[PDB]
From a paper:
The F9 ectodomain exhibits a bundle of five α-helices (α) packed against two pairs of β-sheets (β). As the transmembrane domain begins after the α5 helix, both ends of F9 are close to each other and to the viral membrane. The atomic structure revealed that Cys33 and Cys55, Cys47 and Cys127, and Cys107 and Cys149 form three pairs of disulfide bonds. Cys47 is located in β2 and together with Cys127 it forms a disulfide bond, which stabilizes the β-sheet pairs at the bottom of the molecule. This cavity is missing in F9, although a hydrophobic area similar to L1 is found. With regard to the divergence of F9, its differing orientation of helix α3, its absence of a myristoylation site, and its lack of a hydrophobic cavity likely contribute to F9 functional differences from L1.
Poxviruses are unique in requiring eleven transmembrane proteins that form the entry fusion complex (EFC). The fusion apparatus is embedded in the MV membrane and consists of eleven proteins namely A1610, A2111, A2812, F913, G314, G915, H216, J517, L118, L519, and O320, which comprise the entry fusion complex (EFC). F9, the subject of this study, is a 23.8 kDa protein with a putative transmembrane domain near the C-terminus.
Author numbering: 2 to 166
The structure:
Amino acid sequence: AETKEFKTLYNLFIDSYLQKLAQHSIPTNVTCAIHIGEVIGQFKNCALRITNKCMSNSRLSFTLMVESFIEVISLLPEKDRRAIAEEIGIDLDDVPSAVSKLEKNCNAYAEVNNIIDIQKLDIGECSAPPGQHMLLQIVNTGSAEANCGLQTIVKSLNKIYVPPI
């Protein structure tokens, strides 16, 4: 039959984040200044879903990006929440609109990185047991700094397994 989904926390995050992206479209899209043209990682039974859904500014991306992270991470024990939040660079006490260290780290990476309209994205490890698949929805928001934020979140939440239900 068809392979069953090997769900992780990133699935919960992206599903939350995609809902917010659809609402915060004022038009439908603007001119996507950047596109995802290159995905790297270690693939075993990987299911990638690449979509464009770009918007006006990265601050709005990171805001809903942070709302979803806080919303999803709360399903973890206390010490697990603060530990991963510190690795990504998000403060669980700040309001979801506060510029996290993640966003500043991403904004700073964009100031030196290679200009051009194509972005490479590293999804880390996309592996699932035989008979299963890891769905990994990657959304381009037309910003190099926002795509950097999603990448950091992928490479962390993707390692945390959600038992099936």
